[PDB]
Amino acid sequence: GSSGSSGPDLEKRRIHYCDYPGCTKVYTKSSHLKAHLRTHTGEKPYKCTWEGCDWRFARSDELTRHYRKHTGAKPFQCGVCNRSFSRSDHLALHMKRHQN
Ligand SMILES: [Zn+2]
Ligand SMILES: [Zn+2]
Ligand SMILES: [Zn+2]
């Protein structure tokens, strides 16, 4: 068992469903789908070294810009301490510290 041999296949025109979790994209083509999957398969070495943030990017520039959001404005800011937070729940629960 050393030799080998492979080959494609064909069948009626059916609806193909992306074998990816969450994804809701479909296509009635085997060629178009493969091209789409390319998006799911890749690599994201660049990681946001921010507190709380656990996202990642592929392009260096992409990240840089994203980071700006942290080094700028925040969708969550306290009143008393006037601090900034990434998550909402944290802010709500945080208040406790202020009050009794
Ligand atoms: Zn997909
Ligand atoms: Zn981030
Ligand atoms: Zn506060």
> Which-ligand-closest: CA of 33?
1
CA distance 96 to 98: 5
Strands 26-27 and 16-17: antiparallel
**88 burial class (0-12, 13-18, 19+ CB within 10 angstroms)?**
exposed
Dist. CA 30 → ligand 1 center (Å) = 13
> Which-ligand-closest: CA of 16?
1
Looking at residue 94, what DSSP letter applies? Answer: H
The first and second tokens of residue 36, run together, are 């789409």
**Helix (H), strand (E), coil (C) string for 14-69:** CCEECCCCCCCCEECCHHHHHHHHHHHCCCCCEECCCCCCCCEECCHHHHHHHHHH
Strands 56-57 and 46-47: antiparallel
Dist. CA 49 → ligand 1 center (Å) = 28
